[PDB]
Amino acid sequence: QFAKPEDAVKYRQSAITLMASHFGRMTPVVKGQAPYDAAQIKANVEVLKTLSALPWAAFGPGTEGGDARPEIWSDAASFKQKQQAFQDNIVKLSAAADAGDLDKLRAAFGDVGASCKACHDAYRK
Amino acid sequence: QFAKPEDAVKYRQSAITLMASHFGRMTPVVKGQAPYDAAQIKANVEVLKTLSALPWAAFGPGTEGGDARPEIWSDAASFKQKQQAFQDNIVKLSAAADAGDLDKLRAAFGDVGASCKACHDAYRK
Ligand code: HEC
Numbered sequence: 001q002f003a004k005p006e007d008a009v010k011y012r013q014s015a016i017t018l019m020a021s022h023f024g025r026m027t028p029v030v031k032g033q034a035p036y037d038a039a040q041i042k043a044n045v046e047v048l049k050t051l052s053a054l055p056w057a058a059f060g061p062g063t064e065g066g067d068a069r070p071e072i073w074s075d076a077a078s079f080k081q082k083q084q085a086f087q088d089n090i091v092k093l094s095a096a097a098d099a100g101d102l103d104k105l106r107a108a109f110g111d112v113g114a115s116c117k118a119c120h121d122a123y124r125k
Numbered sequence: 126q127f128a129k130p131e132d133a134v135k136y137r138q139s140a141i142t143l144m145a146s147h148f149g150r151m152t153p154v155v156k157g158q159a160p161y162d163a164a165q166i167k168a169n170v171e172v173l174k175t176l177s178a179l180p181w182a183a184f185g186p187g188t189e190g191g192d193a194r195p196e197i198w199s200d201a202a203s204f205k206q207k208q209q210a211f212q213d214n215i216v217k218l219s220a221a222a223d224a225g226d227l228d229k230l231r232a233a234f235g236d237v238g239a240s241c242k243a244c245h246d247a248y249r250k
C-alpha cells in the first residue's frame with residue numbers, strides 16, 4: 001500500500017508509536033500507581049492486539065530505512081520469529097485482560113515488554 | 126496517557142497517518158484498478174474502524190499543537206459533531222464491506238472521504 005519505501009517507514013513508525021502508547025499507558029496500572037478497572041484494560045488491550053499486528057506488513061521487500069536494521073530482510077525467518085513471539089505474548093496479555101486478573105496482567109505485561117526489547121536488541125538501529 | 130502535549134500531538138498524527146493509510150489503500154479497489162476481494166476489504170475495514178476511533182482522544186484539553194486549529198477546543202461540540210459524522214460514515218463503510226458489495230463500498234467510501242475533508246476544512250491548519 002506504499003508508493004515509496006519512505007511511506008512504509010512512516011507507516012511502521014506510526015504503527016509502532018501507537019502500539020507503544022497502548023502498551024506503555026498501562027504501566028501505572030500494572031505498578032498499582034493507577035487504579036485497575038478490568039473493563040478499561042480489556043478494551044485497551046483489544047486496541048493493542050489490533051495495533052500489534054500492523055507494523056510487520058510495513059517491512060516488506062525494498063522498504064529499508066528508518067531505524068530498521070538490514071538484518072530484518074536478510075534474516076527474514078529470525079525477524080518473523082521475533083514478531084511472532086511478540087504477538088504470541090500479546091495473546092497472553094489479551095487472555096489476562098479478558099480474565100480480569102491484575103496478577104496475570106502484570107506477568108503478561110512484563111513478558112510483552114521483554115519481547116519488545118528482544119526485537120530491538122537484534123533489529124533496531 | 127500523554128506526559129506532555131507534544132506526546133498527544135505525536136499520537137494523533139500517528140493515529141491519523143494509520144487511519145489514512147487504511148482508508149486510502151482502498152482507492153484502487155473502489156476505482157476498479159485493483160481487484161475486489163470481499164474478505165480482504167472486510168478485514169481492512171475492520172482495522173480502519175478500530176483506527177478511526179483513536180485520534181479524537183488525543184485532542185484532550187491542553188493538547189494544542191501540530192496542525193490542529195484552536196477551534197477544536199473552543200468549539201468542542203462542533204468538533205465532536207465532525208468526528209461523530211465521520212465515525213458514523215465509517216459504520217456505513219463497515220456495513221458495505223461486511224455485505225461484500227462493491228457498489229455500496231464505493232458509495233460509502235466517498236461519504237467517508239467527504240467527511241475527512243469536511244473536518245479538515247474547519248479544523249486543520
Ligand atoms: C520486532 C519484531 C519489534 C517488536 C516486537 C517491537 N519493535 Fe519497537 N521497533 C522495531 C523496529 C525495527 C523499529 C524501527 C522502525 C523504523 O523503521 O524506524 C522500532 C521502533 C520503535 C520505536 C520508535 C518508533 C518511531 O516513531 O520511530 C518505539 C517507541 C518502539 N519501537 C517501541 C516498541 C514497544 C513498546 C514494543 C512492544 C510493545 C515494540 N516496540 C516492539 C521492532 C520491534
Ligand code: HEC
Nearest residue numbers: 138141142145148190191192193207208211241244248249
Ligand atoms: C476531524 C474530526 C478529522 C477527521 C474526520 C479527519 N481528520 Fe485528518 N486531521 C485532522 C486534524 C485536526 C489534523 C491535524 C492533527 C495535528 O495535530 O497535526 C489532521 C491531519 C491529517 C493528516 C496528517 C497527519 C500527520 O501525520 O501529521 C492526514 C494525512 C489526514 N489528516 C488524513 C485524513 C483522512 C484520510 C481522513 C478520513 C479517512 C481524516 N484525516 C479525517 C482532523 C480530522
